């Protein structure tokens, strides 16, 4: 009595759901296919970015729970569920460890000039060791923008294990949270820009953070400093980032998120040896996919058994 609008990130969530419910799978949804199989179901799983409009909720009679595939909920008609007594739940933060490790990977890679030194050896220029010198992270200053799930885990590892001085900028967290991860929360963003040897951004994308890192920000940063962005592409005004690299306002950057996405085949950032990329894979591990599949599949069984799930979007229904 459950419909899967799109496949889950891991098959374990499908096997678990088949233990307790009659499961139906729609693989590539169109405007008409969804409804003719949604009219009688009691639970629905929506894969981002597939959309679920008011026409779909109106036809699902026994529907009691809507679950997204991840944090994204913009494609779902929340209003149609709050009035009808339907609880809607998302699955956020289940790739926190993945991006935390991925962020660390890019900080170390920039410090050890990894991708550059790899090509030099691969092209027989092993003697580049006489001209290039890596950087030791122990003792350097890390600037964390956004002390959320990822920012805290990154801060915790860099301050204690890597023995870095971690500054944090996040006005929406209690003043005592930065001390729990041995970081120092600051109130002025300019202070974090001038003092950091590395700047890694993990904030939510808001109207405030949209293009928060423009040319005005890059000027304040040390010329030897580096930028890491695993959050969202729009957080950095990319032309100003191209300017900072070319005019050497910063020593380099590591980029997992782009604007626009996907980045064009001839992105000007590709030319620089001090900029490295990953194709938006920071939170894409097999383990993270299982967690999203489990959390989404399991919260379905919670509502069908009367238990309050942890990630309700409309609390006015409980």
Ligand X SMILES: NC(=O)c1ccc[n+]([C@@H]2O[C@H](COP(=O)([O-])OP(=O)(O)OC[C@H]3O[C@@H](n4cnc5c(N)ncnc54)[C@H](O)[C@@H]3O)[C@@H](O)[C@H]2O)c1
For helices 96-111 and 114-122, give the axis angle rounded to 10 degrees: 60
**Among residues 216, 261, 271, 307, which one is catalytic?**
261
Is 102 marked active-site? no
Q: How far apart are CA 62 and CA 130, in angstroms?
A: 71
Letter string b/e over residues 41-75, b meaning 16 or more CB atoms within 10 A of that residue's CB: bbbbbbbbebebeeebbeebeebbbbbbbbbbbee
Q: Shortest gap between Cβ of 144 and its own copies (angstroms)? A: 16
Under the rule (CB under 6 A), what is the footprint of ligand X? 71, 93, 95-96, 99, 109-110, 113-116, 128, 131-132, 145-151, 169-173, 202-206, 208-209, 230-232, 251-252, 256-257, 273-274, 276, 280, 282-283
Tokens of 158: 């860099």
Q: Shortest gap between Cβ of 154 and its own copies (angstroms)? A: 11
Q: Shortest gap between Cβ of 46 and ligand X (angstroms)? A: 18
**Among residues 47, 202, 232, 237, which one is catalytic?**
232
Is 138 marked active-site? no
Indicate the residue among 21 and 105 with the shorter CB distance to ligand X.
Answer: 105
Indicate the residue among 171 and 306 with the shorter CB distance to ligand X.
Answer: 171
The DSSP symbol for 52 reads: B
Indicate the residue among 86 and 102 with the shorter CB distance to its own copies.
Answer: 102
Q: Shortest gap between Cβ of 276 and ligand X (angstroms)? A: 5
Helix (H) or strand (E) holding 245: helix 238-246
> Among candidates 221, 312, 238, which has minimal Cα distance to 275?
238
Among ligand X, its own copies, none, the one that 277 touches (CB under a kind-dependent 5 to 8 A) is its own copies
Q: Shortest gap between Cβ of 40 and ligand X (angstroms)? A: 35
Is 84 marked active-site? no
* Contact present, 143 and 198 (Cβ < 8 Å): yes
Beta-ladder partners of 87:
65
Rg over CA atoms, the chain: 23
Beta-ladder partners of 199:
143, 227
Q: Is 21 strand, coil or helix?
A: coil
Among its own copies, ligand X, none, the one that 252 touches (CB under a kind-dependent 5 to 8 A) is ligand X
Strand order across the 198-201 sheet: 184-185, 165-169, 141-145, 198-201, 226-229, 252-255, 275-277
Under the rule (CB under 8 A), what is the footprint of its own copies? 97-98, 101-102, 104-106, 108-109, 111-112, 114-115, 117-118, 120-124, 126-129, 132-139, 156-157, 160-163, 262-266, 270, 276-281, 284-288
Q: Which residues are catalytic?
A: 232, 261, 280
């Amino acid at each position: 009595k459950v419909l899967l609008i799109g496949k889950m990130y891991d098959e374990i969530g499908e096997k678990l759901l088949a233990e307790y419910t009659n499961v139906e799978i729609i693989k590539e949804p169109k405007q008409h296919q969804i409804h003719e199989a949604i009219q009688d179901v009691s639970g629905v799983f929506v894969r981002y970015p597939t959309k679920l409009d008011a026409q779909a909720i109106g036809l699902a009679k026994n529907l009691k729970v809507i679950s997204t595939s991840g944090f994204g909920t913009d494609a779902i008609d929340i209003a149609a569920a709050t009035k009808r007594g339907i609880v809607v739940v998302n699955n956020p933060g289940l790739s926190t460890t993945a991006v935390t490790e991925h962020t660390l990977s890019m900080i170390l890679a920039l410090a050890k000039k990894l991708t550059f030194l790899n090509q030099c050896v691969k092209a027989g220029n092993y003697l580049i060791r006489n001209q290039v010198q890596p950087i030791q992270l122990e003792g350097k200053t890390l600037g964390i923008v956004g002390l959320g799930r990822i920012g805290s885990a990154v801060a915790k590892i860099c301050s204690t294990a890597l023995q870095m001085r971690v500054l944090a900028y996040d006005p929406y967290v209690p003043s005592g949270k930065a001390d729990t991860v041995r970081a120092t929360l600051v109130q002025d963003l300019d202070y974090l820009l001038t003092e950091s040897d590395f700047v890694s951004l993990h904030p939510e994308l808001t109207d405030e953070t949209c293009e928060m890192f423009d040319l005005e920000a890059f000027k304040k940063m040390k010329p030897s400093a580096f930028l890491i962005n695993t959050s969202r592409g729009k957080v950095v005004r990319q032309p100003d980032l191209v300017t900072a690299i070319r005019e050497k306002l910063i020593a380099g950057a590591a980029i997992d998120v782009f604007e626009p996405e996907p980045p064009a085949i001839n992105n000007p950032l590709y030319e620089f040896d001090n900029v490295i990329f990953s194709p938006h894979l920071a939170g894409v591990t097999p383990e993270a996919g299982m967690a999203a599949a489990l959390s989404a599949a399991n919260q379905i069984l919670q509502v069908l058994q009367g238990e309050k799930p942890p990630y309700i979007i409309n609390p006015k229904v409980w």
